[PDB]
């Protein structure tokens with residue numbers, strides 16, 4: 025899962041040390057930097073095998089609940105039946121194979137309330153309080169003897185979107201446990217250029233494209249209090265859409281500028297459209 | 310850089326918002342006065358009782374409270390784990406209006422330059438309101454409260470709260486705040502003065518009738534009936550009485566505070582209002598220019614273009630009652 | 646932030662000072678144009694010959710030159726060591742006017758943002774004037790030269806030199822200079838426009854007679870005959886002809902460049918000029934408001950208060966001759 029990853033080696037290597045210890049990481053950054061992609065590939069790296077089965081992915085939303093996550097009582101034809109969740113089931117596979125590493129992917133974790141979701145279990149998923157010793161009976165367990173214990177093998181990945189202005193303050197309960205990591209857009213990186221040169225992109229267009237977006241990304245980071253640094257545009261748009269072997273050129277670019285980048289600027293710059301026109305012009309002109 | 314004594318400024322806001330002893334406080338600067346108003350002002354509300362608005366609550370509880378919502382009840386299957394979705398009315402002080410007070414007090418304490426007593430007493434008061442939730446204030450919040458269901462008293466302090474928030478600037482430190490230099494800019498001072506008189510005249514000049522009057526040009530244009538290009542002309546105030554009408558234009562200038570050349574640029578606006586205005590009653594037409602001066606007050610009269618016009622000033626810094634007396638003395642001469 | 650193309654601006658200064666191909670230079674920005682004017686302008690003077698003013702010199706020399714000053718001669722006893730104090734007239738180019746040119750060129754070269762050719766050619770010219778002494782320029786130096794003994798041509802470049810020095814700001818480095826953002830401020834742009842028309846009208850409108858007219862209020866005051874408090878009122882221009890008089894007020898505004906609300910605040914001044922003004926000839930009274938616009942030109946007429954008044958705009962950025970044509974087309978309509 026490591027042949028062409030646009031992100032620098034430092035962070036992806038640093039994460040591997042960080043994750044093996046802390047086991048609860050939050051990957052910040054703008055949307056469109058492959059937050060699922062980098063973690064999904066990294067999930068294979070920590071295992072060392074490009075195997076999907078051990079890996080599971082869920083997207084959190086405000087109404088995501090303990091019932092979906094862990095245990096709930098959905099009805100059968102006549103009467104109510106306890107139904108295993110995602111994480112609850114997820115652990116049962118990991119318990120069989122402690123030598124192996126099982127990984128839980130949580131997209132957009134900030135949106136939902138962690139407490140209502142995890143409930144009892146939020147204590148357990150922390151790296152220290154793991155194993156049979158910290159086992160607790162679950163809320164819906166009829167019998168005290170049945171317990172749920174997080175094995176040490178589990179590694180937890182959470183993805184958070186920096187871009188939203190609606191965000192004001194990170195959840196406290198989230199901050200105590202997880203190790204936050206900042207993902208830059210990485211628009212100017214070797215592997216991204218090396219990918220782009222491999223496709224039919226001339227150096228001037230690369231130097232033009234990489235430099236011009238840097239000026240725009242620099243603008244958003246420059247106005248720190250007005251807009252967060254993580255607001256700066258990512259690179260995933262340029263990755264996809266070229267699968268057919270299409271040559272990247274300014275004629276091709278202008279669609280992405282108008283289609284993908286333009287709404288992004290539109291929301292970010294909601295005060296003066298002329299200011300948007302200042303920045304849209306430089307992209308092509 | 311001479312300016313008006315600050316204590317007198319607060320009185321002008323009173324008429325501006327249309328609704329105490331200021332000698333007691335020893336701090337000349339404005340925020341000491343205004344903070345003391347709020348800090349003491351809050352105490353009057355609490356004695357009578359703060360506003361309590363029934364906020365409906367729809368929540369999942371272990372029992373029946375008020376009206377059960379059948380739809381959400383079955384869909385979540387809360388019947389089986391002994392829970393119901395019911396709508397009920399908790400009675401709180403958590404209204405938008407009251408949250409503003411508590412959030413405002415944080416800003417008042419956070420202000421870097423302030424009297425020690427003012428900051429100390431409020432922090433207790435900040436502590437005294439546990440249930441209410443802090444907020445990050447914007448004008449849009451105050452905008453929502455234009456409905457004014459609350460009492461007349463509540464609107465007074467909130468109007469003050471509107472003044473403080475806009476006139477608050479971060480200072481030396483990231484956290485703390487610093488007060489705006491309100492006095493130096495004429496424009497906000499000017500809009501105050503124009504607003505100060507307009508509401509003031511309604512109070513004291515019960516004899517006369519006072520309204521702001523929009524005027525339309527006497528012109529006709531072949532191009533457009535709209536005359537959009539022409540300037541919009543709206544009086545500052547008109548104070549009409551049966552015997553005589555009078556239009557006034559008043560503004561705050563720094564040069565005029567100096568006792569040399571004189572700034573009467575606004576007069577160009579005044580005459581043109583007289584011309585396009587035609588009185589149906591035809592009793593009389595009079596004009597007034599009044600400006601703020603610091604040291605002393607001087608009154609002049611003119612017969613300019615067949616119109617009887619007065620230019621006058623007021624000795625701000627003198628005393629608030631005599632100043633109140635001074636205006637009534639002023640208008641009576643010209644209102645005749 | 647849209648503004649007028651810079652090449653056209655230079656023409657407005659020409660009429661402003663009352664006294665070439667600008668297509669040749671490729672630099673759109675102003676200092677490239679103006680520097681090229683001076684750098685080429687100097688060459689015209691040198692061909693005919695620069696001004697040479699006899700400066701008397703009183704010095705101690707080994708011989709008789711001109712008139713010996715007997716007093717200083719004996720007092721210093723210079724007779725004995727073969728020297729005399731004599732007054733004589735060296736003929737130099739060291740005049741105040743010419744020093745300004747050389748000192749000015751240093752500033753032009755020192756300007757940080759400039760065309761390479763302009764800076765290169767002048768440095769030779771800077772070298773080409775060895776005798777003249779560099780100076781540190783102030784407005785007071787230009788003030789001394791209001792006598793204008795020099796020719797009409799000399800005053801042209803010096804007027805430019807006055808513009809450059811005032812519109813020069815130190816930039817990145819202590820030594821080098823940076824050009825002023827002249828375009829953005831309306832006030833200097835406005836005073837140019839008012840001055841631009843006033844001298845322009847003298848040139849082209851030979852048919853009519855054009856003068857700036859001071860006016861006195863129709864008022865009488867019991868207090869003071871002076872009426873010092875009343876505003877001083879001085880026309881921007883009056884362009885009188887036998888058949889009809891016309892008063893104009895023109896200003897440069899940024900909002901009006903936008904095609905919404907309209908800024909006609911100056912109109913309040915205009916009507917009042919009409920009223921206090923009484924014509925002895927009694928031929929007619931007319932008014933004009935003219936403003937700068939970028940895209941296109943629109944003309945309107947009005948019959949407001951018994952007066953015939955026009956509001957119009959001009960499409961700056963079009964072309965200098967058609968613009969020159971445009972004004973003559975404009976005034977002819979209203980001058981009637």
Ligand SMILES: Nc1nc2c(ncn2[C@@H]2O[C@H](COP(=O)(O)OP(=O)(O)O)[C@@H](O)[C@H]2O)c(=O)[nH]1
Nearest residue numbers: 028029030031055056057058059060061260263
């Ligand atoms: N090949 C490659 N693809 C990338 C890279 N970064 C992002 N992508 C792709 O960009 C697309 C969007 O990724 P993602 O960030 O998860 O979408 P998001 O939910 O909007 O944030 C996926 O196809 C990613 O695999 C990269 O560095 N290299």
